[PDB]
Amino acid sequence: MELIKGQALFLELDKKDFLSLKNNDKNIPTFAHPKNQEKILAIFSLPYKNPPQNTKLIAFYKDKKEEIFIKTLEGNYKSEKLQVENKKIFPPKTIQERIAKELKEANAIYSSYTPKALFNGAFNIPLNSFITSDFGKARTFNEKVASYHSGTDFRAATGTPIYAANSGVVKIAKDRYFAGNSVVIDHGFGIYSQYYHLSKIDVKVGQKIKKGELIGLSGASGRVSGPALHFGILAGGKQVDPLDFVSKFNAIFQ
Ligand SMILES: [Zn+2]
């Protein structure tokens, strides 16, 4: 019941007489424990940027309240001190609008909660190469965090086939300002995977997709630093450390 910022954890709770799980009147959804039928699960995530120092949750049962305290740990993320901090960019109106529009779309998707499992066992990595840029690489103008790498980058020459980390429904399959050519998949229970900077999109919004199924070709779209696959996980409303999430998720749903 310590959690590093930008990570998810799976809380286990007794199923019997459970009524709700709350965080200051935010209801946290619950789903079945796959291997213990007397338990349920909930995903709790702390944001990378500007998280609470401590979190208290209440699980309300028919005959009892149960408090749950989680301290925010800082972790050991690569960070470096920005030296400029003009901090305010001044983009053209046409770009501000497209960003704004795409941000409203994405927030509508990531806020929605499909209350069933759309995945199929464990997550696989979307590509069998290696990490060239880690999740959580931060740029700080003290005393906090100016920007951070909200996913992890795999080495990929332009045109490398990218496969869905798990089964789900495609919710985004288009070119967006920061993500380039983007695929976003709903796996259920508020878990979304993100495949950014693609050179080709091979799926369509609404499509049901299987684990291991081709979703496009890596590229360098929307990416300044050249070709790579940006892979993200959003869970519990927040961007979380994707390889961390996958190992925790797979430890439960294998
Ligand atoms: Zn990235």
Residue numbers in the entry: 20 to 273
From the paper:
The Pgp3 monomer is structurally divided into four regions: the N-terminal domain (NTD, residues 21–95), a flexible linker (residues 96–147), the LytM domain (residues 148–259), and the C-terminal helix (residues 260–273). The Pgp3 LytM domain contains a highly conserved tetrahedral Zn2+-ion-binding motif (H168xxxD172 and HxH249).
The importance of these two complexes is that the scissile bond in the peptide substrate was seen bound within the active site. Both peptides contain the common motif, mDAP3-d-Ala4, and only the third amino acid is different, i.e., mDAP3 vs Ala5. In the pentapeptide-bound complex, Arg158 might form salt-bridge interactions with d-Ala5.
